[PDB]
Paper text:
To enable investigations of the emerging roles of intercellular shuttling of l-lactate, we now report an intensiometric green fluorescent genetically encoded biosensor for extracellular l-lactate. To construct a prototype l-lactate biosensor, we inserted circularly permuted green fluorescent protein (cpGFP) into Thermus thermophilis [name] l-lactate binding periplasmic protein at 70 different positions. To develop variants of eLACCO0.1 with larger ΔF/F, we performed two rounds of linker optimization, followed by seven rounds of directed evolution by random mutagenesis of the whole gene, with screening for l-lactate-dependent change in fluorescence intensity. This effort ultimately produced the direct response variant [name] with ΔF/F of 6 and a strict requirement for Ca2+ at concentrations greater than 0.6 μM.
In an effort to obtain molecular insight into the structure and mechanism of [name], we determined the crystal structure of [name] in the l-lactate-bound state at a resolution of 2.25 Å. The overall structure reveals that the cpGFP-derived and [name]-derived domains are closely associated via an extensive interaction surface that contains numerous molecular contacts. The [name]-derived domain of [name] retains the same dimeric structure as [name] itself. Trp509 in the dimer interface forms a hydrophobic interaction with its symmetry-related self via π-π stacking. Mutagenesis of this residue abrogated l-lactate-dependent fluorescence presumably due to disruption of the dimeric structure, providing support for the conclusion that [name] functions as a dimer. The structure of [name], which we assume to be representative of [name].1, reveals that the imidazole side chain of His195 is likely a key moiety for mediating changes in the chromophore protonation state. The [name] crystal structure reveals that Arg142 forms a salt bridge with Asp439 in the l-lactate-bound state. This salt-bridge may further limit residual interaction of Asp439 with the chromophore (possibly due to increased distance or more effective charge neutralization) and thereby contribute to increased brightness of the l-lactate-bound state and a higher ΔF/F. To decrease the affinity for l-lactate, we introduced the structure-guided Tyr80Phe mutation to remove a hydrogen bond between l-lactate and [name]. This produced the low-affinity [name].1 variant with apparent Kd of 3.9 mM.
Residue numbers in the entry: 11 to 281, 295 to 356, 360 to 589
Amino acid sequence: RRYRWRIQTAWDAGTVGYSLFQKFTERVKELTDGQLEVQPFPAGAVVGTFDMFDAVKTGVLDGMNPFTLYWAGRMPVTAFLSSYALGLDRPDQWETWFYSLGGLDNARRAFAEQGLFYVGPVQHDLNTIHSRKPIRRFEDFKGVKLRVPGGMIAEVFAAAGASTVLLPGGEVYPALERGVIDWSHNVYIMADKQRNGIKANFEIRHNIEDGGVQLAYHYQQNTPIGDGPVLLPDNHYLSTQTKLSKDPNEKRDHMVLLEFVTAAGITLGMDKGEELFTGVVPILVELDGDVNGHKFSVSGEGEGDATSGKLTLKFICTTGKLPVPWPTLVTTLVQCFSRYPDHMKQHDFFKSAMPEGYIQERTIFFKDDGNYKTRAEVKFEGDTLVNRIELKGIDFKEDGNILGHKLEYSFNDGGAADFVGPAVNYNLGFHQVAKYIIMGPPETPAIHQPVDLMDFTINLNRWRSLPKPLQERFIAAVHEYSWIHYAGIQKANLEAWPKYRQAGVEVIRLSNEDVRKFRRLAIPIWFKWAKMDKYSREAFASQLEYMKGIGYVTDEELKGLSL
Ligand SMILES: [Ca+2]
């Protein structure tokens, strides 16, 4: 009669990808005269993304539109049915390998053993890396917390020193906001009723220039200066992205600072001084400091825009050379500029205390070293928001990372994520939570996933129930959609790159030498996955022959590796 197939895709609703997938279901009805209908489902609507394989195998779903290498843990061949690092890197090469060099039937025999019919690949895009750490060379990957899709992709970055996690794309945004895993620099804000203010305790990790890390434990309390009513918040956190730079025309010891601050951590829809921040507000900071008796003064000026959460400031040490590293002063040197979403406005203590302002006190303990004690008044002086600070430091090793100036000029939480290409990652908001894009050099712009293929895979019993004329038409339909989908994604990507620059994202290009370093790690990983079983061996053997044929692999660089 009429055949109806439920098919869930890896694409989340509200991506370019899902819109294209939805149009595919209409094309299939057209091409089959209404006889085959595909009911489309966005990611998660029927089962979790990574649960699609078992759902289709058992028939809960009739089919799926996944990224094929998601099955790498249970079907090694699938790590070879989508690009892997520094291998074949053009869409046309993967088309050739699939449709004339044996790939399609290699995939179909492997999936038939699982009760699945692999229809064909779906072309898509390269992938980008979105990072909160400025990763400018190979060695900067060490200690990064990186989301990736498992398999060989994760193994390559793990071998370069990264910690890897596996998450679906629709969960990447909140993960990047919280450090991806293990630790972050988020400040949980808690009401302090007895001081009619707030308190917070958090831990900053300062990178040591030669490796590894210097911990700075922060204790914080805030109390209003005046007696007007303030807002006492429910639990929530502030997440800050900070960029530190230098002014090339400034000769005093200084720090140029750019920050983006968002309040979060309250779920939407659960059962006066704010007006002063509706536009751009000038800022002045003054700090008078004394660390082990080394005296100094810092002045800063700039502005903040709480509607955006953006701060722009320049700081100068006016007494000469700063005796401590500038990154150790970032937390001391105006949380009233945080961007609070509409549904969280009632939790903004910092703006509620203005204009008379608030006192901010901290103790900051550097592990195995001295401590800072800081006290600050933050308030309006006229129309300028001012932060005046006294800082006193004691018990520091002149030997140490602080007085020895051994800390990297940086301030970030080490989180980064690959997912897909720039347009869909923009659909998911990555530009808001990561201000760097890490790409390869112009010779090798995509190091880990240059050809990130989807597919259609159908429950094998459902497939065999379909009359053969509709089978062939569905195969044709998928092959046509592979390139319609590709073309749609590529068009959106053209629109997305300018939007990244407007959001303040910087594109960082690694070097050819960085690529060579990845390549010496990638080739052994190819052979290890290839040897897992007979399907992965067959697919890599034919890909390796092809790569040798077009000059992508030399025999010398294998250094003895063979199947
Ligand atoms: Ca990816």
